[PDB]
Amino acid sequence: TIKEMPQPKTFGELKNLPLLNTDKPVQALMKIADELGEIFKFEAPGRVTRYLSSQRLIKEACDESRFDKNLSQALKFVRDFAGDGLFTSWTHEKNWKKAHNILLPSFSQQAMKGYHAMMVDIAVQLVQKWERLNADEHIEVPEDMTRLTLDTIGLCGFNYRFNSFYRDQPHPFITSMVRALDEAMNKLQRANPDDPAYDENKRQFQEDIKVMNDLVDKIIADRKASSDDLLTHMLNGKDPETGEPLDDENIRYQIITFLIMGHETTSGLLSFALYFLVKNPHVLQKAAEEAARVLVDPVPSYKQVKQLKYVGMVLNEALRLWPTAPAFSLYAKEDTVLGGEYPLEKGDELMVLIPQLHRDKTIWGDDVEEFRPERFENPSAIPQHAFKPFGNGQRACIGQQFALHEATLVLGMMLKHFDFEDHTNYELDIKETLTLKPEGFVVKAKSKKIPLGG
């Protein structure tokens, strides 16, 4: 039975555009979905897409025989500086399958065991800063969490030291990154983008792109002048299928790609986790009993991090409520029918809105806004395609196990060494630069006086 598709109100030539006049576009689209349900069309001048929210319809869009990965308007604007690297290439470009095969070995169990000692070095530098603050003083949470995650990928991936804890303002690569992502998001809401009114926005965009690339030159110069790491395989590895290596131009696009996607989403996860623990004290208490029982030595081991079983349940429930890269896009390979009721033509686009999928009552029950880590107690026992914070199929996230090992280690050392206080009674305010993070979150931390090691 062929249905007409739902759609919000239109305004002559403007289409649906005056319904997103905001710096928080994903939060606004969540409100249109609660009003119309599992599927709606959305139009702006020149272009069209379709937003999906239920488990039954997202199960079908994830069939790789019928639909593949699409570049959204948002990733087309980022491609202006990340090129044909892993995150912004089409699946049919020569460099996608090639880079994939050449770089996959850097994420194996052997290599993970080899990164552990470098992760502890940055972790110790964070506990030392908080042990040395005076009693009149407080902590800025998302700012210190991005100091730890940028330095950690710098050392493990490239053997370079950004030294972010020897500065009291943010690193200069960070300042230009955050104005570039912001500009790309603002571009999406303009009617006529060519006018002389947007000439200065365009010139500032080029200045932030040159700042990022100046850092790439610096890393290339240090390896030259100087390992079995990510940079090693970029300069020497060969694709077992075609026998080719990567050219110079593609290699620069991969440095930029791994520095940005390799820290920004991990910082965001650690900030939401601490926010939910200080607003739920029966949950905080229990996660602290685990850290004190399991971590009996002066610095943590690789095998001990694997035993921190409840701290992992906490991290997954934080990603269910606020997944830190909150959408991904798809296109139809040939004419087809979706759900048994909506015909589609070769080429039309679809968009998975991840925070709505994670509030489907037919799958999780009627209490979807509560914070309850115990949902994840026997995981093999939750349906397939209900939980997707890392994407789908052959284009899923390559860094999944890296991030989760980093986060479980750092959160357990935080809970062993300090008690925390919500001193300003903080109200949640979520900032959007394509990705998500809580703005202005601040705390106080009192030390339990327990010594560190070497």
Ligand X SMILES: CCCCCC/C=C\CCCCCCCC(=O)O
Contact set with ligand X (CB under 6 A): 25-26, 74, 78, 82, 87, 188, 257, 260-261, 325-327, 434-435
Catalytic-labelled residue, pool 390, 420, 433, 435: 390
Work out what residue 145 binds among ligand HEM, ligand X, none; the CB cut-off runs from 5 to 8 Å by kind. none
One-character DSSP codes across 273-307: HHHHHHT-HHHHHHHHHHHHHH--SSS--HHHHHT
Give CA–CA dist 60/74, Å, rounded. 24
Ligand-binding site membership of 160 (annotated) = no
Is 390 noted as a catalytic residue in this protein?
Answer: yes
Give CA–CA dist 426/64, Å, rounded. 44
Pick the piece of the chain touching ligand HEM (CB under 6 A) from 205-213, 305-313, 390-398, 438-446. 390-398
Nearest partner of 437 among 211, 177, 207, 165, judged by Cα: 177
Catalytic-labelled residue, pool 146, 149, 152, 265: 265
Q: Shortest distance, CB of residue 268 to ligand X, whole angstroms?
A: 11
Q: Shortest distance, CB of residue 372 to ligand HEM, whole angstroms?
A: 20
Give CA–CA dist 293/452, Å, rounded. 17
Q: Does residue 399 touch ligand HEM according to CB under 6 A?
A: yes
Give CA–CA dist 84/70, Å, rounded. 14
Chain mean position to CA 80? 20
Nearest partner of 254 among 105, 101, 85, 88, judged by Cα: 85
The Cβ of residue 428 has, within 10 Å, a number of other Cβ atoms equal to 13
Give CA–CA dist 106/91, Å, rounded. 21
Pick the piece of the chain touching ligand HEM (CB under 6 A) from 36-44, 128-136, 257-265, 417-425. 257-265
Work out what residue 398 binds among ligand HEM, ligand X, none; the CB cut-off runs from 5 to 8 Å by kind. ligand HEM
Is 397 noted as a catalytic residue in this protein?
Answer: yes
Q: Shortest distance, CB of residue 433 to ligand X, whole angstroms?
A: 8
Pick the piece of the chain touching ligand HEM (CB under 6 A) from 35-43, 47-55, 191-199, 394-402. 394-402
Is 1 noted as a catalytic residue in this protein?
Answer: no
Number of residues near ligand HEM (by CB under 6 A): 23
Contacts 24+ apart (CB under 8 A), 241-245: 241/97, 241/98, 241/101, 242/98, 244/98, 245/102
Pick the piece of the chain touching ligand HEM (CB under 6 A) from 1-9, 125-133, 199-207, 260-268. 260-268
Contact status, residue 19 vs residue 36, Cβ threshold 8 Å: no
The Cβ of residue 26 has, within 10 Å, a number of other Cβ atoms equal to 18
**Nearest residue (CB) to ligand X, 28 versus 111:** 28
**Nearest residue (CB) to ligand HEM, 300 versus 323:** 323
Q: Does residue 272 touch ligand HEM according to CB under 6 A?
A: no
Nearest partner of 160 among 168, 150, 175, judged by Cα: 150
Q: Does residue 184 touch ligand HEM according to CB under 6 A?
A: no
Q: Shortest distance, CB of residue 149 to ligand HEM, whole angstroms?
A: 8
**Nearest residue (CB) to ligand HEM, 17 versus 354:** 354
Ligand-binding site membership of 51 (annotated) = yes
Q: Shortest distance, CB of residue 450 to ligand HEM, whole angstroms?
A: 29
Q: Any idea which residues carry the catalytic annotation?
A: 265, 390, 397
Which residues are part of a known binding site for (9Z)-hexadecenoate? 51
